């Protein structure tokens, strides 16, 4: 629309002709290639050799400058926020992701409730985990919680355990967190 | 009682405060509406 | 925060556990609430949950109630949410009289349902409602059209205002040169032959 | 890169000469010393007196302006955090 006006405005047709203007000279510097160069040149805050004459093209240059004043000013405002790195999302996020992979070994404390949970489970996702855990039972089923915590640190291993004991570990080691929501709900009760 | 079938907790129920949107003339907000006139009366003044 | 103010009235269902909780509480914060609630007991202690929910909507009122019933309401009304964490922890239990052969049989029967996940399947059947369009999820706030918006409006209105100056520049020229050269309406169309030329010229 | 393209593009060859050349005074004003000055002059947000004319040099002018638009904007947005020096916060504040 700058090129349409500059080929319609009867004042943009100026003569370069510096000495003494005779006749038969005048020509627009706004070719259609040039009008992108004013549009890109004003948008990139650097300014062009082009500068309009002829008030109808000044208003296009006036409103496009106030357009690109706000867009550059708004872009620099949020740019302090978005220059923060995000750490990698874990390849597991729930029981469905952790069951459908063989890269990360996973088990629980043997002779515990979690081993007993998947052993007598009939959920199709959770039966896949006990189908996994029963095969390499010597390797992935550790003997205690402390051996389960240590093999997460010293290897590539996701460990199935209680929620409240995670609440003590993750407040102690800040490199190691809870993945996903609670599978079931249980309770510590004083046995009699 | 039997042994529970659902876990509870006392909590507070209250209305959400309305998130009034920054309407599409939001970029005029960082200056007062008389300062936008005072800049406009400057560039109409200093140019004169 | 809710104890240290008098702007927002607050109560609970009368003859319930929450009223019983603050009545026999010895926490210094929670005793302040029952010191509040016992005075204007007729006003802030509603008779049911449904009267408690409605007075949050129809007035300035924060309501003390169970967590799981909030989980059904906030999935139904998206203008009204849970404030803060859980005060205590309790449980819905199937009540039996003082000494019954049905206490231990249900205790077996409840534990059978949760390892089969059926207590979780029944809770998702009822507490899942409209889905409730959730939250802005407070993070960095990349600018959409809804909050820049008007700089395209003044750009569109600026180009509309520009082209009437362009015909204003056209007619003021077409009235000026036609004083001596040509006539009024035709010399406008003469310059239309100039402008529609695809080349450079005089 | 701009000096390579300016000598290679046959449209940056113009004659300065605003008055009736009649044979040949065609020049190619981008030297080495002018090509760095367009690069430095756009890097410091000031802008030179020299502007590309052929489209073969406009994209070089176009991308380099967009490059310096992001460098300077990322410089200003980050430096607000580094002048506002977050003070000494030795991690003991109370008995807790
Ligand atoms: C993101 C990308 C999207 C696409 C980009 C946008 C589209 C691309 C735009 C393509 C065309 C625009 C490029 C500049 C002009 C081309 C010049 C040229 O090729 O060499 C010519 C030198 O002769 C001239 O230079 C004559 C100058 C013409 C006026 C310049 C603007 C009018 C173009 C109006 C453009 C359409 C507007 C509506 C019509 C008014 C050689 O002459 P020619 O080859 O033999 O041509 C016939 C000769 N004639 C013209 C002299 C009679
Ligand atoms: C540095 C440059 C300075 C230039 C000097 C000129 C400055 C003269 C300006 C003077 C005052 C203009 C702004 C008014 C003050 C804003 C406060 C307000 O209450 O308005 C509000 C009403 O919305 C409006 O009515 C805004 C005015 C509409 C016209 C905007 C023209 C843009 C300026 C043309 C310059 C381009 C050309 C420039 C030259 C080529 C806007 O806020 P809101 O978002 O609606 O909030 C409610 C939303 N809600 C209802 C959902 C909750
Ligand atoms: C030499 C010295 C000068 C001599 C003295 C001369 C006398 C001058 C004395 C002036 C005295 C001041 C009187 C006005 C006060 C307004 C403030 C206000 O509160 O109202 C509103 C201003 O919001 C607007 O609507 C502004 C109008 C549109 C903005 C575009 C104007 C400039 C356009 C581009 C300029 C191109 C620049 C070209 C440069 C070459 C804000 O509140 P609101 O909520 O938005 O109200 C809505 C009102 N409405 C419903 C009707 C919409
Ligand atoms: C070439 C292409 C043309 C095609 C496109 C044309 C299309 C444009 C049509 C029409 C554009 C012109 C009228 C504006 C109405 C737009 C409609 C609108 O959105 O409502 C507006 C009301 O109205 C206003 O608030 C605008 C106030 C004046 C600003 C516009 C002129 C600038 C004044 C200075 C002169 C500058 C020039 C001189 C500078 C030197 C915005 O209020 P809203 O309703 O709440 O917004 C809805 C958003 N919502 C749904 C989220 C709630
Ligand atoms: C242009 C000619 C072709 C060149 C092609 C070869 C050049 C390459 C040379 C070096 C790079 C080699 C390394 C990367 C190779 C692949 C590229 C890549 O990264 O893909 C990117 C897309 O790529 C794009 O879409 C960006 C292209 C920008 C186009 C600019 C046009 C400007 C013209 C306008 C000028 C206006 C002028 C104004 C005046 C009028 C994204 O991929 P990714 O995010 O990195 O993937 C990560 C995946 N991961 C997340 C799993 C880890
Ligand atoms: C201030 C005014 C300046 C105007 C310039 C505007 C230029 C065009 C603007 C935007 C065009 C593309 C917008 C999509 C970018 C989103 C991020 C993204 O996808 O990155 C992804 C890969 O990277 C990509 O896939 C993008 C590939 C193209 C990059 C180069 C574009 C700049 C053109 C060069 C020319 C320079 C200028 C030409 C003139 C000289 C990274 O993965 P992700 O982030 O995890 O995925 C999220 C994807 N999502 C957000 C879409 C959901
Ligand atoms: C969100 O909550 C209400 C809903 O609009 C707003 O406050 C009430 O608004 C109605 C009209 O919609 C008035 O009749 C009431 O008198 C208002 N009450 C109060 C206490 O203000 C409230 O302003 C909205 N916005 C925010 C930010 O809370
Ligand atoms: C060059 C001209 C056209 C610019 C616009 C007019 C100027 C001279 C006028 C318009 C409104 C005026 C301001 C109105 C209010 C105050 C607050 C007062 O406590 C100190 C003076 C001060 C800050 C004035 C300074 C001068 C001022 C900015
Ligand atoms: C200015 C011209 C040349 C190019 C841009 C086109 C303009 C007119 C169009 C393109 C995208 C459009 C916006 C797209 C989405 C919305 C959100 C809606 O809730 C209100 C209208 C609004 C805000 C539109 C307003 C007009 C708009 C800004
Ligand atoms: C909407 C209209 C009526 C109001 C604006 C009037 C416009 C179209 C006209 C009226 C008089 C015109 C001016 C008359 C004389 C000259 C001197 C010349 O060397 C450059 C153009 C210039 C500066 C004109 C620019 C456009 C102009 C200002
Ligand atoms: O294993 S239980 O004794 N009975 C089953 N349930 C729940 C249904 C959630 C709960 C919930 C919380 C507990 F502390 C104990 C139990
Ligand atoms: N704490 C569990 C054992 C460990 C586990 O299963 O995670 C139990 O009481 O049986
Ligand atoms: N649900 C509670 C009553 C309501 C309340 O105290 O909040 C109970 O079982 O006693």
Q: Does B27 touch chain C (CB under 8 A)?
A: yes
β-sheet bridge partners, residue C11: C63
d(CA A42, CA A58): 13
Q: Which helix (H) or strand (E) holds C121?
A: helix C118-127
Give chains near B: 3+ CB pairs under 8 A: A, C
CB neighbours of C59 closer than 8 A, spacing ≥ 6? C9
Beta bridge partners of C66: B10
Tokens of A114: 């979690």
Provide the pairing of β-strand B6-7 with A105-107.
Answer: unpaired
Q: How far is A31 from chain D (nearest CA, A)?
A: 12
Q: Is A31 strand, coil or helix?
A: coil
Coil vs helix vs strand at C149: coil
Contact criterion met (CB below 8 Å) for C147 and B21? yes
Ligand 4 atom closest to the CA of C154, numbered from 1:
32
CB atoms within 10 A of CB D93: 7
Distance in angstroms (rounded) separating the CA atoms of residues C10 and C7: 10
Strand-pairing partners, residue A159, are: A107
Residues in chain A within 8 Å Cβ distance of C116: 122
Cα A99 from Cα C164, distance rounded (Å): 68
Residues with Cβ within 8 Å of residue D12, at least 6 apart in sequence: D6, D28, D29, D30, D52, D53, D54, D56, D57
Length of chain B: 48
Q: Are C165 and A57 in contact (CB under 8 A)?
A: no
Q: Given the DSSP bridges, would you call strands A105-107 and C9-11 parallel, antiparallel or unpaired?
A: unpaired
Cβ-based contacts of B7 with chain C (< 8 Å)? 67-68, 89-91
**Chain A residues 75-104 with a CB less than 8 Å from chain C:** 78, 81-82, 84
- Give residues with Cβ within 8 angstroms of C87, minimum separation 6: B9, B10, B11, C21, C30
In the reported structure, the alpha carbon of residue C69 is separated from the centroid of ligand 11 by a whole-number distance in angstroms of 18
Separation between Cα atoms, residue D38 and residue D47, nearest integer Å: 7
Sign of CA dihedral A109, A115, A118, A119: positive
**Angle subtended at Cα A158 by Cα A152 and Cα A161, rounded to the nearest 5 degrees:** 95
Task: Describe the strand order of the beta sheet including C61-66 as a list of residue ranges.
Answer: C9-11, C61-66, B10-15, C80-83
Spatial CB neighbours of A180, under 8 Å, sequence gap ≥ 6: A92, A93, A94, A95, A98
The residue length of chain C stands at: 202
User: d(Cα A156, Cα A143) in Å, to the nearest integer?
Assistant: 18
- Return the DSSP state at A27: B
- Decide: helix, strand or coil at residue D7: helix
User: Token pair for residue A49?
Assistant: 């050799």
Radius of gyration of chain B (CA): 27
* Distance between CA atoms of residues D46 and D40, nearest Å: 9
Q: Measured between beta carbons, which residues in chain D are less than 8 angstroms from residue A46?
A: 42, 45, 47, 65
Is A74 in contact with B27 (Cβ distance < 8 A)? Answer: yes
End-to-end CA distance of chain D: 62
Q: Burial code of A73-95, b = ≥16 C-beta within 10 A, e = fewer?
A: ebebeeebeeeeeeeeeeebeeb
Pairing of strands C9-11, A157-159: unpaired
The residue whose CB lies within 8 Å of the most ligand 13 atoms, and thus the one to mutate among C10, C11, C15, C16, is C16
Tell me the CA distances in angstroms from C192 to A29, A102, C170, one per residue in order: 19, 76, 10
Alpha-carbon span D95 to C41, nearest angstrom: 40
C72 phi-psi bin (left φ>0, alpha ψ -120 to 50, beta other):
alpha
Euclidean distance between CA atoms A62 and A47, whole angstroms: 13
Residue B35 token pair: 């300062």
- Cβ of D59 below 6 Å from ligand 5: yes
Quickly list DSSP for D39-52. Answer: HHHHHTTS--S---
D94 CA to centre of own chain:
53
Q: Is the dihedral of CA B7, B12, B13, B18 positive or negative?
A: negative
Give the number of the ligand closest to the Cα of residue A163. Answer: 12
By CB neighbour count within 10 A (0-12 exposed, 13-18 middle, 19+ buried), where does A36 fall? middle
Please name which of C118, A190, C11 lies closest in space to residue B12, comparing C-alpha atoms.
C11
- Of C56, C85, C92, which has the smallest distance from its Cβ to B4's Cβ? C92
DSSP D13-32: -B---SS--SS---B----H
By the 10 Å C-beta count (0-12 exposed, 13-18 middle, 19+ buried), C52 is classed as buried
Cβ distance A9 to A61 under 8 Å?
A: no
A181 SS3 class? coil
| Cβ neighbours of residue D1 closer than 8 Å, sequence gap 6 or more | D60
Cβ–Cβ below 8 Å for D58 and A37: yes
Token pair recorded at residue C92: 């819905």
Residues in chain D: 96
DSSP bridge partners of C63: B13, C11
Tokens 């004013």 belong to which residue? A38
| Residues of chain A contacting B7 with CB distance shorter than 8 Å | 185
Structure tokens at C114: 């949760």
| Angstrom distance (rounded) from CA D30 to CA D3 | 7
How far apart CA D82 and CA C60 sit, in angstroms, is: 44
Structure tokens at A136: 């390499």
Judge whether A69 is closer than 8 Å to chain D, CB to CB: no
Q: What is the DSSP letter of C13?
A: B
């Amino acid at each position: 629309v700058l090129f349409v006006i500059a080929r319609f405005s009867p004042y943009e047709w100026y003569n370069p002709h510096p000495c003494n203007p005779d006749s038969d000279v005048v020509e627009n510097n706004f070719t259609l290639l040039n009008s992108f160069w004013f549009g890109v040149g004003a948008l990139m805050q650097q300014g062009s050799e082009l500068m309009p004459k002829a008030l109808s093209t000044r208003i296009v240059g006036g409103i496009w400058w106030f357009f690109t004043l706000i867009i550059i000013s708004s872009y620099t405002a949020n740019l302090a926020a978005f220059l923060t790195v995000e750490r990698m999302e874990s390849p597991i996020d729930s029981a469905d992701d952790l069951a459908k992979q063989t890269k990360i070994e996973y088990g629980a404390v043997e002779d515990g409730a979690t081993m007993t949970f998947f052993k007598k489970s009939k959920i199709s996702t959770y039966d896949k985990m006990w189908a996994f855990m029963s095969s390499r039972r010597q390797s992935v089923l550790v003997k205690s919680n402390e051996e389960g915590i240590q093999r997460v640190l010293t290897s590539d291993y996701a460990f199935l355990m209680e929620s409240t004991t995670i609440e003590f570990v993750t407040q102690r080691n800040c490199n190691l967190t809870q993945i996903g929501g609670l599978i079931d709900s249980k309770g510590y009760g004083v046995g009699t | 009682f039997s042994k529970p079938f659902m876990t509870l907790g006392i909590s507070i129920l209250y209305r959400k405060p309305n998130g009034t949107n920054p309407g599409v003339f939001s970029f005029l907000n960082p200056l007062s509406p008389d300062i936008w006139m005072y800049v406009l009366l400057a560039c109409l003044g200093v140019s004169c | 925060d809710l104890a240290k103010q008098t702007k927002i009235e607050y109560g609970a269902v009368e003859d319930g556990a929450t009223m019983t909780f603050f009545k026999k509480s010895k926490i210094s914060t929670y005793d302040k609430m029952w010191a509040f609630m016992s005075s204007r007991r007729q006003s802030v202690l509603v008779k049911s949950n449904e009267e408690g929910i409605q007075r949050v909507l129809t007035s300035d009122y924060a309501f003390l109630m169970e967590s799981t019933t909030i989980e059904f309401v906030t999935q139904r009304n998206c203008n009204l949410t849970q404030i803060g964490g859980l005060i205590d922890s309790k449980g819905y239990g199937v009540g039996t009289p003082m000494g019954s052969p049905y206490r231990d049989k249900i205790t077996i029967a409840i534990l059978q349902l949760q390892e089969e996940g059926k207590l979780h399947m029944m809770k998702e059947k009822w507490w899942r409602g409209n889905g409730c369009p959730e939250e802005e999820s407070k993070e960095a706030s990349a600018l959409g059209v809804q909050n820049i918006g008007g700089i395209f409006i003044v750009l569109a209105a600026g180009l509309v205002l520009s082209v009437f100056v362009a015909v204003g520049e056209f007619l003021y020229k077409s009235k000026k040169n036609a004083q001596l050269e040509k006539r009024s309406f035709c010399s406008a169309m003469v310059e239309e032959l100039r402008m529609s030329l695809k080349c450079q010229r005089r």
